[PDB]
Amino acid sequence: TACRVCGGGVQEFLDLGRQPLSDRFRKPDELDDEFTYRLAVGRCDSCEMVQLTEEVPRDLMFHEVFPYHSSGSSVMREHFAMLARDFLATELTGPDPFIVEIGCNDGIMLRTIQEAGVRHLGFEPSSGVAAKAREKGIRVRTDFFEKATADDVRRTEGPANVIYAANTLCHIPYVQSVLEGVDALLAPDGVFVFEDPYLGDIVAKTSFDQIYDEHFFLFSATSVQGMAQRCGFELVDVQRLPVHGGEVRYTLARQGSRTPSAAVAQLLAAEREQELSDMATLRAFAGNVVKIRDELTALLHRLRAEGRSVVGYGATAKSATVTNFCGIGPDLVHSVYDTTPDKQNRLTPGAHIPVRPASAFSDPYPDYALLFAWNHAEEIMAKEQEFHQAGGRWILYVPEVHIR
């Protein structure tokens, strides 16, 4: 397998087996045929980039029925509004500033830009969520960001002061074409800013459910610094974020155009000191993955033997990896509750557990809820105090299998 960043050799450390598309939710009547692929992860020999060993073609994941609605979380709505206000106070202060977002989804970040009257453009090749952004008055192009479409936007709209991508850069194997696009489009003094699940968090929390079709790369500061450098950019800031199980926001500028924050060198030194991307650490993570599988299925089977009911909460893309690697289906977890209309009255991929509206998670409550949306624990548990007061308990499997 050749590294998608630098062409070095990729060495596998974890094999999650055959997996379905994480975001495809079938009607119960649909034939049980699904596209599958081998999900496994390795680390490049030369640049330390951790990445999957099989690419799922983009069109199979992102398209008119891609289901994820960013705005379905109040935490994430606030998180992106604040980001947007931060950009409007700093990088977008010129005359006629321009910001491009890669992956704007339903307009969770760009609405704030639009409301500020700032010129902007979102790339959103999944047309269903693209439409929701256009309804809020956001300018959206229903296309993938890549070298050529970036060219097209530079030609017609001029340079962007800011190009931003959240939970999207790590989804793109063709990151070199994206970087070529960023080079063509970004102002000489602008910044390309992206935030994605952080390898450090994944390793410390054993959060293997962060590994699935749409997550091609598990970025670290070490590997991003390398990938930037090789394309003529430089990692000039890093910021850790608690969202989505733990992320880093990376800020790239043209090389030497700005001085790197002390936070960059410090995070690098921490990564180096903790041997984050050494093959041995990544293998130890893989070993911990198997322990979590074993403990979780032992728990679920015990619950069933003791006549306790178990449902799941959150029909996450992440959960596809849990249910398929661990072999958890409707016999162990009878339903999954979720707020996304187009995931309701469907079956989860691979495991085929029925998905029901969260409004259906109500008295009489099940004994246990397996919390797939564990990155949303605070927000969800706050809305579900009655469940816990009634005696229902949460099953978590990050960072360890435990009930509370």
Ligand X SMILES: Nc1ncnc2c1ncn2[C@@H]1O[C@H](CSCC[C@H](N)C(=O)O)[C@@H](O)[C@H]1O
Annotated binding site for dTMP: 68, 318, 338-339, 343, 375-376, 383
Contact 336, 313 (CB under 8 A): yes
Q: Among Zn ion, ligand X, ligand JHZ, none, what does residue 397 contact (CB within 5–8 Å per kind)? A: none
Q: Which residues contact 338 (CB under 8 A, 6 or more apart)?
A: 313, 314, 315, 344, 355, 356, 357, 358
Is the backbone peptide bond immediately before 242 cis, with ω within 30 degrees of 0?
Answer: no
Residue 264: closest CA among 285, 302, 237: 237
Task: Assess 6 for contact with Zn ion (CB under 5 A).
Answer: yes
Q: Which of 39, 40, 44, 311 binds Zn ion (CB under 5 A)?
A: 44
Which residues make up each annotated binding site?
3, 6, 44, 47, 68, 70, 105, 124, 126, 145, 167, 174, 212, 317-318, 338-340, 343, 375-376, 383
Q: CA separation (Å) from 299 to 5, 65, 332, 351?
A: 40, 35, 10, 18
The terminus-to-terminus CA distance of the chain in angstroms comes to 42
Stretch of 31-39, 178-186, 187-195, 316-324 lying at the interface with ligand JHZ (CB under 6 A): 316-324
Q: Of the candidates 318, 341, 319, which has an alpha carbon nearest to the alpha carbon of residue 132?
A: 341
Q: Which is nearer to Zn ion, 3 or 322 (CB)?
A: 3
Tell me the Ramachandran region of residue 365: left when phi exceeds 0, alpha when psi lies from -120 to 50, beta otherwise. beta
**Kind of pairing between the strands at 310-313 and 368-371:** parallel
Using CB under 6 A, which residues numbered 52 to 91 contact ligand JHZ?
68, 72-73
Structural tokens at position 64: 């008119």
Confirm or reject binding of residue 212 to ligand X (CB under 6 A). no
The letter for the amino acid at 84 is A
Considering CB under 5 A, how many residues would be counted as binding Zn ion? 8
Residue type, 249: R
Minimum distance of ligand JHZ from residue 343's CB (angstroms): 6
User: Which of the listed partners (ligand JHZ, ligand X, Zn ion, none) does 338 bind, with a CB threshold of 5 to 8 Å by partner kind?
Assistant: ligand JHZ
Query: Least distance to ligand JHZ from the beta carbon of 358, Å?
Result: 5
Least separation in angstroms between residue 332's CB and ligand X is 29
- The window from 46-54, 94-102, 180-188, 346-354 that contacts Zn ion (CB under 5 A) reads 46-54
CB 302 within 8 A of CB 320: no
Tokens at 130, concatenated:
């693209």
62 touches ligand X by CB under 6 A:
yes
17-56 footprint of ligand X as x/- string (CB under 6 A)? ----------------------------------------
Residue 325 touches ligand JHZ, criterion: CB under 6 A: no
Helices (H), 206-246: 221-230
| Maximum Cα interatomic distance, the chain, rounded to a whole number of Å | 67
Q: How far is CA 368 from CA 178, 201, 205, 340, 402, in A?
A: 43, 26, 22, 21, 12
Binding residues for Zn(2+): 3, 6, 44, 47
Dihedrals phi, psi of 394, to nearest 5 degrees? -90, 135
Query: Which one, 193 or 231, has the nearer CB to ligand JHZ?
Result: 193
Binding of ligand X at residue 102 (CB under 6 A)?
yes
Helix or strand holding residue 176 (H, E): helix 175-185
Binding mask 112-151 for ligand X (x = CB under 6 A): -----------xxxx--x--------------xxx-----
User: To the nearest whole angstrom, how small is the minimum distance from the Cβ of residue 347 to ligand JHZ?
Assistant: 14
For residue 46, the surrounding DSSP H or E stretch is: none
Chain residues binding ligand JHZ by CB under 6 A are: 68, 72-73, 167, 171, 214, 314-318, 338-340, 343, 358, 373, 375-376, 379-380, 383
Chain residues binding ligand X by CB under 6 A are: 58, 62, 66, 68, 70, 76, 102-103, 105, 108, 123-126, 129, 144-146, 166-168, 171-172
